[PDB]
Ligand binder design. Structure first.
Ligand SMILES: O[C@@H]1[C@@H](O)[C@H](O[C@@H]2CO[C@@H](O[C@@H]3CO[C@@H](O)[C@H](O)[C@H]3O)[C@H](O)[C@H]2O)OC[C@H]1O
Length: 189
């Protein structure tokens, strides 16, 4: 179990962040495994992957994901210049993060169609401090907790639609939660 922060564990970069409300425990396991256990948590994001990520990585993930409330399971990362927070959402809890968002297209990859959206965060925390930035999303129609994600298919589709990414920062398989409960155990490669 660890303190919020970043680093490396068993060859994999990890990032764990939370708002301090309590109620969430993040654990680094062997190889690319990590677990999250939460009960009436605040806001939090944690997972394993790479720093920096790439625009053509094939990411494999497998495990269990059991949210009770607002939570996402995604390939998650950021780019710099432009600053972008992105998500390839494989599963979620009570809230589809694209609710009310502008649909920017569709892309088929790894066994399902995904809907594409762009949203904006205004004066919110980021990898470079408080800022206004866009978020790119690919939301999988066929929910799952294991699989393979060919990131290039998503990044290329986004670029085609005008959702350009800058230089890649971190890229991980992450469990995100917003004032919810749940458990998850995920292995990344
Ligand atoms: O110490 C600094 C860290 O706190 C900083 O971390 C990033 C903060 O922004 C996080 O992004 C939010 C995650 O939740 C989404 O729902 C929101 O839109 C984001 O604002 C990100 O996960 C953290 O990596 O990194 C820089 C450090 O110096």
């Amino acid at each position: 179990t660890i303190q919020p922060g970043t680093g490396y564990n068993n060859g994999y970069f990890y990032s764990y962040w939370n708002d301090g409300h309590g109620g969430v425990t993040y654990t680094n396991g062997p190889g690319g495994q990590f677990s999250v256990n939460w009960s009436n948590s605040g806001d939090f994001v944690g997972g394993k992957g790479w720093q920096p990520g790439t625009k053509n990585k094939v990411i494999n993930f497998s495990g269990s994901y059991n949210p009770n409330g607002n939570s996402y399971l995604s390939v998650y990362g950021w780019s710099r210049n432009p600053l972008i927070e992105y998500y390839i959402v494989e599963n979620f809890g009570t809230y589809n993060p694209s609710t009310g968002a502008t649909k920017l297209g569709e892309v088929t990859s790894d066994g399902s169609v995904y809907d594409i959206y762009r949203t904006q965060r205004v004066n919110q925390p980021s990898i470079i401090g408080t800022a206004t930035f866009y978020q790119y999303w690919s939301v999988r129609r066929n929910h799952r907790s294991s699989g393979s994600v060919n990131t290039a298919n998503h990044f290329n589709a986004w670029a085609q639609q005008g959702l350009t990414l800058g230089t890649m920062d971190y890229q991980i398989v992450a469990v995100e939660g917003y004032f919810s409960s749940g458990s998850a155990s995920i292995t990344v490669s």
